[PDB]
Amino acid sequence: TYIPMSQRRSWADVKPIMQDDGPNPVVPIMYSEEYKDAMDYFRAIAAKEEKSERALELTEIIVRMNPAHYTVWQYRFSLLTSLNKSLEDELRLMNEFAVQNLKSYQVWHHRLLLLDRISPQDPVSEIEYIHGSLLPDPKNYHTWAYLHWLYSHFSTLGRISEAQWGSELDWCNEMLRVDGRNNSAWGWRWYLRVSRPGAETSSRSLQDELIYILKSIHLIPHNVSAWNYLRGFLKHFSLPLVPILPAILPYTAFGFPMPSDPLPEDTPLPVPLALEYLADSFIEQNRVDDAAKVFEKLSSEYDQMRAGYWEFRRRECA
Amino acid sequence: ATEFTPSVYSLVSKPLPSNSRPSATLDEQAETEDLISQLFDLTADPNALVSEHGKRYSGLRKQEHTQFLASSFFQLPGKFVSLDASRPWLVFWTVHSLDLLGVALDQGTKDRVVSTLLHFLSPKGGFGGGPANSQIPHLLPTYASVCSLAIAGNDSSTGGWKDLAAARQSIYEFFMRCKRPDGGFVVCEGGEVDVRGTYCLLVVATLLDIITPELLHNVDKFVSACQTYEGGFACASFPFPSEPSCRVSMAEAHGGYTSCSLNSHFLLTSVPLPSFPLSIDANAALRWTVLQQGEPIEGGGFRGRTNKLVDGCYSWWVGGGAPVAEELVRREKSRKVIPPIFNRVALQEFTLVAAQQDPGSTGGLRDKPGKRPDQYHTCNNLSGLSIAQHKMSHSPSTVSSNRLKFDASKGLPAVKPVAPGGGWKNEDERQNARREIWANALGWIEEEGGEIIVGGKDNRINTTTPVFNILGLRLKPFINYFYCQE
Ligand SMILES: CCCC[C@H]1CN(c2cccc(OC(F)(F)F)c2)C(=O)CN1Cc1cncn1Cc1ccc(Br)cc1
Ligand SMILES: O=S(=O)(O)C[C@H](O)CNC1CCCCC1
Ligand SMILES: O=S(=O)(O)C[C@H](O)CNC1CCCCC1
Ligand SMILES: O=S(=O)(O)C[C@H](O)CNC1CCCCC1
Ligand SMILES: [Zn+2]
Fold first, then answer.
1. Measured from the CB, is residue B63 less than 6 Å from ligand 2?
2. Which InterPro entries match (chain A) (predicted)?
């Protein structure tokens, strides 16, 4: 049996404020009694700017019914800072919010604001929690973006050690081993190996990265993520395409990894992005006529869904 | 006209190869390929002169979609409480879809739409996701409210446009409070920072004539740094200090954030500031865009991320970004001195065959077969369908004609900047900025002879505008009102 907040002794002093939607508003929502009652008293709490424990409990009740209510989440964080509440306990509440399937843009941002204000000397415990939360959903965009912020924010504070970077690459390599088609993990590797300010750029690192890329392509020749990573890698470091062509030509039918003698089963040829590599390598050699023939085959035969795009690339050769 | 846009029914449908390497990504892709391919097999080819007996007809069920939007517009069940902070989006998704479907609202319903949205406007600036006495202002409902007022409002005393004009200073002050030094914006007080906020802010600022140099500082750099190695754009970029020493993208290239970044960058190119905006890799953005159109076995729909499933809502996000990316590429080729760049036919076939709810049901359009239709996917599917049906391009000759007719002596009061030197240098620079921003905002045209209506002219919907995603017949009177042009 539901007990209205007007009959609760802890709220007898509060005069609720009704939602001012107008007499006959469009897109109205048939709220439950419990949700309308909590928002009626939240409007009164926010009107009097009350920072109290009962206001904190009320915000939790509301966000449990509507985790996307950004105004209530904003008010809740102001309650935590004003009352000097234990942000670690709130962080544990957000862990309980993940088990009960309560997530949104606001829940993830609330966790970010907590870590920012806590500012732990070592955020390794939060890093491990993010890794564990990615197991049910390995491609959660909010989680991957939050992991980028976590490492970026605390490395700015100098709190990410070299051993932490190393174990993070180990975890990223394991994620790609379980599913090499996880484009989110490929982007995370790009941060760890290329884009982050502390990344090493030497002849050994360029060789190691090119080996990992070619091995990933040889393992899954039709993995678009590996091909995009290869094209981005070569373009970012201004590396030529021709020296690596021996490892790509077998897919268009030396000192770097090569495809298997017999290609893996269920690998129909040619690979369209391998043809794009061949055409771009022809342009690198100023062989625009040979590149136009590859673009013409991509447009009319091997990648006809993008027939107009490859035709556009063919006309640019002239 | 369809020589380089082959029909899905005319191409061999083959699954994504496995390379004998199974994974969770391939499991969902193969299952999705089965669902979509089976639905196309049960549906008659839309390009057939007489529809096949025994198979489903793929004609756009506009009256079913109208009824779906109507019932979802006058009453939501309590189960959509998760959208209580997104009610302006429920309005926009409804009224823009009705505009696309060619269905008019009577004046009484328009007045209710205007009055409801004005209750969401805060006196201190900006719209919230709900009534001003319940929710704080937010950049995303501000876009949805401004665009909905462009669709349902008018220039009378009860039209709501005069209320937007009176709120220009407060809205601008709200925008400036959201601004970060690195060029990003929080979507609200204590909110997150991503390119959705930048896009929504730049659209509203463009429409209401409240763009100042202090509002745009570093905004171009934040967006440009969102571009990833794939060519698309991520949600945000991180500023590393030594204004910042460098900026790094924070996630994958994503169809929605690529659309917001391309549209934000395009809106910034109209601003006559020196060495502004910072350039992007347009060729890589165009390459990433066309690579997200699915194979024939998955209906030719667009996916939002590499190695993820096609989704009807990315017909607008990725498909609608294609004319923007194409124009940016054209400007680079012109500075350094034509078939469609995506399959306009296949995208329509995905919309008609796969994205539509099964006939005789609730109506509306959906993410994929097996997903319930909603107002968001209804609006984005139809918005992408409009882009596929109508060849859209940004015409320099139309922009030039707009410059020749612009009246710099007419306009609303200039915005007062927060910082003393945050405004334009002089009146010649401000009026030159108003002209270029107004002229380019009205520069999108539908090319004559480029129309492709798969399945017959009864499937034709109205023409939406790139970047803004409202009909041109709404955009022109709306932006002319706030710039005092006629
Ligand atoms: C009933 C609500 C549906 C939420 C949907 C739309 N959505 C949005 C809502 C309003 C505005 C806006 O962006 C702005 F402001 F217009 F620029 C984006 C989001 O945030 C999440 N989405 C979830 C979704 C559904 N299918 C694919 N996705 C992933 C996705 C992520 C980001 C973008 Br971007 C686009 C798609
Ligand atoms: O598919 S839609 O075009 O949106 C709506 C349906 O076609 C309605 N079909 C009616 C069946 C009974 C006779 C009158 C028409
Ligand atoms: O005068 S303004 O500040 O412009 C408008 C009112 O103050 C808004 N007060 C609301 C109370 C409930 C939570 C959301 C805000
Ligand atoms: O105008 S054309 O493109 O030449 C042909 C018409 O549009 C075909 N529309 C159908 C008519 C019969 C009912 C279902 C729709
Ligand atoms: Zn979607």
1. yes
2. Prenyl_trans_a
Which of B116, B133, B241 is nearest residue A43 as measured by Cβ atoms?
Answer: B133
| Distances A318 to A113, B339, B340 between C-alpha atoms, Å | 54, 16, 18
Pick from B43, B41, B37: nearest CA to B55: B43
Residue B391: which residues within 8 A CB-CB, separation 6 or more? B340, B344, B446, B447, B450, B451, B452
Residue span of the structural domain in which B214 resides: 1-486
Considering only CA atoms, which residue is closest to atom 15 of ligand 2?
A: B63
SS3 of residue B124 by DSSP = coil
* CA nearest to B297 within chain A: A305
- Which token pair is B79? 């189960």
Indicate which residue of B199, B374, B435, B460 is catalytic: B374
Active site residues of A: 103
- B249: part of which helix (H) or strand (E)? strand B246-249
Residue B313 annotated among the catalytic residues of the structure: yes
Provide the token pair at B16. 């994504």
Any idea where the domains of chain A sit in the sequence? 1-318
DSSP state of B413: P
The answer to whether the CB of B119 is under 6 A from ligand 3 is no
How far is the alpha carbon of A257 from chain B, nearest alpha carbon, in Å? 17
Torsion angle, CA of B446/B451/B456/B462, rounded to 10 degrees?
Answer: -10
Number of DSSP helices (H) and strands (E) in chain B, helices first: 19, 4
Show the 3-state SS of A153-198.
Answer: HHHHCCCCCHHHHHHHHHHHHHHHHHCCCCHHHHHHHHHHHHHCCC
Contact B90 A149 (CB under 8 A): no
Beta carbons of B411 and B484 less than 8 angstroms apart? yes
Using DSSP's 3-state secondary structure scheme, residue B147 falls into: helix
Give the number of domains in chain B: 1
Experimental structure resolution, Å? 2.1
The torsion defined by the Cα of A114, A117, A121 and A127, in degrees rounded to 10, comes to 20
Atom of ligand 1 nearest to the CA of B376: 1
Are B151 and B95 in contact by the 8 Å Cβ rule? The answer is yes
Dihedral sign (CA B370, B375, B378, B380): negative
> Ligand 2, from B58, B60, B61: best to mutate by most atoms within 8 Å of Cβ?
B61
Rounded-to-integer distance, Cα B3 and Cα B268, Å = 35
Q: Print burial letters for B68-95: b (CB count within 10 Å at least 16), e (below 16).
A: bbeebbeebeeebbebbbbbbbbbbbbb
> Is the CB of A305 less than 8 angstroms away from the CB of B6?
yes
B367 is catalytic: yes
C-alpha B445/C-alpha A32 separation (Å) is 47
**Cα A250 from Cα A56, distance rounded (Å):** 64
Pick the closest to residue B7 from B43, B56, B53 (CA basis).
Answer: B43
Minimal-distance CA residue of chain B relative to A142: B251
CB B222 within 8 A of CB B247: yes
What whole-number distance in Å separates Cα of residue B397 and Cα of residue B415?
Answer: 30
Q: How far apart are CA B273 and CA B257, in angstroms?
A: 25
**B240: Cα within 13 Å, side-chain hemisphere:** 20
Which of A29, A277, A300, A313 would you mutate first to test chain B, the one with the most B CBs within 10 A? A29
Distance CA B95, CA B69 (A): 9
What Rg do the C-alpha atoms of chain B give, in angstroms? 22
